[model samples]
Target: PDREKALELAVAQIEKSYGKGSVMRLGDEARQPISVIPTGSIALDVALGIGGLPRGRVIEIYGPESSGKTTVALHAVANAQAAGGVAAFIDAEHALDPDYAKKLGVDTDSLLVSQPDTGEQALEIADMLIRSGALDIVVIDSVAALVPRAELEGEHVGLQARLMSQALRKMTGALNNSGTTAIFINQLTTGGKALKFYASVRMDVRRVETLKDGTNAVGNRTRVKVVKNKCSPPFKQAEFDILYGKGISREGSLIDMGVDQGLIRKSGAWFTYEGEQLGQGKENARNFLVENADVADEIEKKIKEKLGI
Candidate 1:
């Protein structure tokens, strides 16, 4: 057992210098399971696997214009508030509509919104909030909008990326033990290697269908693809709708989730849930679930069980 003795001696020496438990056999390490904050859409939550966004980790939500990235981030904030946790939004783009956020269930009164002037300032604010240990979630809306002071002064190229790299390095360290999750809403073209490398989860959103009422476009159906996920299996996707004035259509999402999970059977314009007919059209089934909270709850419970959430 000379090799075993040598290994033990090395571990002992490291522990003596760095303190107890600093160095140990991999099996001797205790597993600290990451906690999650639900993103409000059951379908999306199921896709994410762990029920929601991982706490104390970096999350990147990137997509094109009107793809519902901000909406998803707001949904997470609202859910955090609902769970009795504090949340902050770094409005680097200065485009956050408080009224819209309020409509999405975000507690505007308690939510901290910071409008940073520069990219560095935005990351600084995020770092400060994360390190405070008071907030549960902090969102930067977005990476593309973060303009570094040097870039603003006019000269350096790739300055944003370099600044982002440094900022993320610091924020990652701050987020490690703070129990605060950082969500960056990035544009499709703005995501660089630093973000991709640091992010524990990266969701790419895209508009799949446009919901129209007669001649007017009312909303859009957006698909979120979990392109990279460290907490669960990657490449899972979920689709949900975003109404114009209203936020995510929870009822619509429920129906979609039900149909996907086989909790609700769909056949030639007919839908059935729990062996009960829900009516003819998909809209009818969505409305049925909306009207019947009990049925929705049952389906949700079953979905959670099936997903092992």
Candidate 2:
């Protein structure tokens, strides 16, 4: 009973000082103490389940410009705002467009924007933002740019990278101390056969084929090669095509989401929606999305023999 009276007084004083929902430190153990955050998208929401993108975890989105990267980012922020949590966008490269953000229905006020200098104030802002524990999603637009380039090379990039990684890890720990999810955007580069090197989620955004009518789209559909994803099981390549191009178009903005049928050769060659490639239905599309799928047989059977598998 004495301890109970002391606990009430302590709780009251802490609340008076830091306001409601303020936690000073971990409860004896240093780990996430169970809090839920929800994803606003239907497919992604269900695929990931209930509270999407756990607050303590880090999800990285790595793709070339205009290949659904911004869309996903905007969607994440908007979704989090809709879920009733402020979303922070530390757009390291300043690529966010306010007009577009407005169009996406993200409550701008609920979203914080910061394009801090890589090594100077940005890190501090980042620390403050994460430590505030008042966000549902904190997106770091370019982690690659956050740390020096020399620090991202390899074995050497290890200690430096881990140190920088620890900096954010501490921030995320604070986020978990409250309840906030973090998404770090990483830049991509041609890493030889292993292109699109960035972070845990390495995506190679190369045009494999296109349906641009007269444009020789032999290289279109942004091939999302998962260079690495340690959070989840090794994921199969996500075959995403450009649904729309950026411009003013009478046809709802001339967006080209290359959704026509496609055939990916064993050698990584993608056949656009040309000639016989169009007739193959969703089944063919399904098979390829599966891992280690040898289209050689599916190409032999499902696809027209004319494909010359």
Candidate 3:
């Protein structure tokens, strides 16, 4: 008993050295509260099983071109801002569309958009920003575009990947202790492989189909597959549609999402779901999904069942 008391005092001293509430008691690992910033998608949040992107962690979102990868990240940034948090975008490509980000609800006036000369530098800056604990979210809108200093100076092979691996290693502890959520956007290899690494969440995004208007491609129906989710479960998928100049047409897309989740029924030119019957026409379907308590309940129920909650 005396030895155990002495060890407790020793642990207390260690905790104080780090700062109050920085050290977790042994066997109390699951007691920590995970902060999450909603990704601005109700269905996606439900799939995440913890409201949204878990703060103080790493999230890797990878997919093909025009698969809504940037779209989701921007939405997450906006959501973080709405929760009273600052954000930054580390544009490795030096290409950031302020107008589009703003349209997607990002407050650009306060957002810090920086283009890194090299990928390693980008990750280095990310580590420093996350450690400062001043920001809420930092998006590296592409790991693939990040060039290694070694490569720029012509001195290394596989340096970019090594730098990224090292950066991720160094940032893990800092992120685990800070409030900032680091979202790394990556591109798929020509072989259809995503960069493999250790992260709290790994989302695989893809374009499942196209939304057209009179033989013209207007938008796309995108699917976000949660390949790995430590905050929730793995292999969860969320489908939503995006339109040109219209963003996520919740009413129109909700019908498709509802149908996919078995929450809605459709046959020929008629649509039925949650006690509401409508037509297959775009306008009719959109109007029917405006808003209602019954429909909301059904959505929640279906999500709950899928999430096993």
Largest lDDT belongs to which candidate?
1
For residue 216, model 3's alpha carbon misses the true position, in angstroms, by 2.1
Candidate topping TM-score: 1
lDDT of 2 by residue, 1-309 (tens): 799899878977986896433333322221222443433222232223222344555566666565555555566677678767788788667677777676656788667888764533555676787777766677777665665434333214343355454465456456557666666665552111121222323334344656454564322344444444433323334443333432111111101112212333221233323233422333234333333234333432333232211
| lDDT of predicted model 3 | 0.73
Query: Candidate 3 on 198-304: residue-level lDDT in tens?
Result: 57778888899998877998889888888776665456788777776555655664566566677778876778775668557665776665556466456656754
TM-score of 1: 0.85
Model 3 ranges with Cα > 4 A deviation? 1-35, 189-195, 252-283, 287-309
Model 1 has a clash total of: 0
Ranking of candidates on lDDT, top first:
1, 3, 2
Over all chains combined, what TM-score does candidate 2 have?
0.51
Runs of candidate 2 exceeding 4 Å displacement: 1-51, 147-163, 189-309
Candidate 1 per-residue C-alpha lDDT over 1-309 given as tens digits, one digit per residue, 9 for 90 to 100: 789899888878986886443543432322235567888788888778778888888999999887899999998999888989999999878888889988989999999988988889989988988889998999998899889887777755777888889998899878878888899888863536799988888999899989887899889988999988766667789988788888888778777887877887887799887678887986677778779888877888887776567
